[PDB]
Every structure is written in structure tokens, then in C-alpha cells.
């Protein structure tokens, strides 16, 4: 938003079989940083 990029997160343990689980909770903000860049695309990183 308007000069800033910012991140929120949460963690929980579950035993549901194979899907994004039910219930409720909300994310806390963890950082903000002024990158000023235009954004349109993204990707995710994983290791073998």
C-alpha cells in the first residue's frame, strides 16, 4: 500500500486429514518495509 509492504502471520497444530482446516483465529503483523516497488507477480521457495 502507497509506499509500504507488510507481513502478518500465525501458527497452529492440527490433526485434520488432507485440507485447510476449519475453526477461527487472526494474524498478528510481524514487519513493514518501504520497498516502493511496483508489484504484479510472485513465487514461493522450497528445498529438496
Partner 1 sequence: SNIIRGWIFGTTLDSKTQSLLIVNNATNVVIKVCEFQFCNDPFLDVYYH
Partner 2 sequence: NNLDSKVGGNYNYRYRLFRKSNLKPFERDISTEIYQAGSKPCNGVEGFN
Ligand X SMILES: *[C@@H]1O[C@H](CO)[C@@H](O[C@@H]2O[C@H](CO)[C@@H](O)[C@H](O)[C@H]2NC(C)=O)[C@H](O)[C@H]1NC(C)=O
Binding region for partner 2 (CB under 8 A): 2-3, 34, 36-38
Which parts of 5-44 interact with ligand X (CB under 6 A)? Answer: 38, 40
Q: State how far the Cα of 32 lies from the Cα of 4, in Å rounded to an integer.
A: 7
Q: State how far the Cα of 37 lies from the Cα of 45, in Å rounded to an integer.
A: 20
Q: Residue 3 has which C-alpha cell?
A: 509506499
Site string for partner 1, 16-45 (x = CB under 8 A): -----------------x-x-xxxxxxxxx
Q: Which residues bind partner 1 (CB under 8 A)?
A: 5, 33, 35, 37-48
Amino acid at each position: 500500500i502507497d509506499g509500504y509492504f507488510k507481513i502478518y502471520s500465525k501458527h497452529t497444530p492440527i490433526n485434520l486429514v488432507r485440507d485447510l482446516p476449519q475453526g477461527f483465529s487472526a494474524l498478528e503483523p510481524l514487519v513493514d518495509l518501504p520497498i516502493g516497488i511496483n508489484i504484479t507477480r510472485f513465487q514461493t521457495l522450497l528445498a529438496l
